[PDB]
């Protein structure tokens with residue numbers, strides 16, 4: 001029942017979702033905890049919502065997985081909705097319990113990074129590139 005989790009996290013790191021870059025969209029680039037992760041996160045908004053999203057970069061398994069899962073979780077949400085999820089994720093990876101972590105989708109599998117301090121920032125990188133993208 002747990003072996004499936006490894007396959008889901010592995011799939012997000014090896015075959016990222018919403019990977020690459022969107023056309024005609026000024027990307028948002030941030031980088032490392034210290035680990036050496038980087039991401040270019042192009043985000044499209046048609047309304048206040050997120051029409052589409054895409055990312056590219058280089059990181060550890062944790063950081064790539066987390067970027068990939070972040071895209072799934074936020075696609076078609078809202079400056080504020082997306083930003084609330086970011087807060088939810090960020091709090092989850094500091095050991096907080098919250099039923100709302102369900103709204104994170106497969107990113108919920110990264111609850112375990114709260115036990116690895118150096119990994120916190122690996123996992124949040126994508127979320128913070130999102131925060132910046134929304135806030136333009």
Ligand SMILES: [Zn+2]
Pocket residue numbers: 033035036037059060062063119121122
């Ligand atoms: Zn990392």
